[PDB]
Amino acid sequence: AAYFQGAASTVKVTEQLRHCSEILKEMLAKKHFSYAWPFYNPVDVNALGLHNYYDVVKNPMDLGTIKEKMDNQEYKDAYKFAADVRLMFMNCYKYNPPDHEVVTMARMLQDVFETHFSKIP
Ligand SMILES: CC[C@@H]1C(=O)N(C)c2cnc(Nc3ccc(C(=O)N[C@H]4CC[C@@H](N5CCN(CC6CC6)CC5)CC4)cc3OC)nc2N1C(C)C
């Protein structure tokens, strides 16, 4: 009984993290490029002229960083992964006026993410 329950837990967490990897690859996949490209790389605040970005956004996040964190064994559960993805979107909505096209793009990518995440075991 104890070994079986222990194995069930290991299997579940592993399946959940494999789903996370599939979702990250889906968001980085090329079918979503039209609205995902602003989230591929960290914001270069100097090139973009955004001297206040780090004052507003205390914990910047982007898909490239999440990928390096996942490749470096840093997510021990799917819920920490999901929190980093949602942070990326939350930062976009906090910094930008809702009428900016980048916010529309975030909403489209977030819908993709949430639809796939809602299917996590
Ligand atoms: C970080 C905040 C938000 C966000 O949440 N994410 C995730 C995000 C991600 N990626 C981007 N990309 C770019 C955004 C913009 C450009 C551009 O050419 N910007 C030009 C506008 C200003 C210009 N200078 C010179 C001329 N000056 C004109 C004089 C009259 C004042 C005005 C100031 C030159 C550069 C290029 C991008 O990438 C190639 N933007 C993002 N935003 C945007 C709202 C900034």
Cα separation, 20 vs 59, in Å, equals 21
Terminal-residue alpha carbon distance, the chain: 22
Ligand 1 center to 81 CA (angstroms): 28
- How many helices and strands (H and E) does the chain possess? 7, 0
Q: Tell whether ligand 1 has an atom less than 6 A from the beta carbon of residue 48.
A: yes
Distance from residue 61's CA to the centre of ligand 1 (Å) = 17
User: Rounded to the nearest 5 degrees, what angle is found at the Cα of 97, between the Cα atoms of 56 and 105?
Assistant: 100
Q: Are 106 and 92 in contact (CB under 8 A)?
A: yes
Q: Using a 6 Å cutoff on CB, does residue 95 contact ligand 1?
A: yes
Is the CB–ligand 1 distance for residue 100 below 6 Å? yes
Ligand 1 pocket residue status of 49, Cβ below 6 Å? yes
Resolution of this deposited model, Å: 1.7
Domain boundaries, the chain: 1-121
Please name the method used to determine this structure. Answer: X-ray
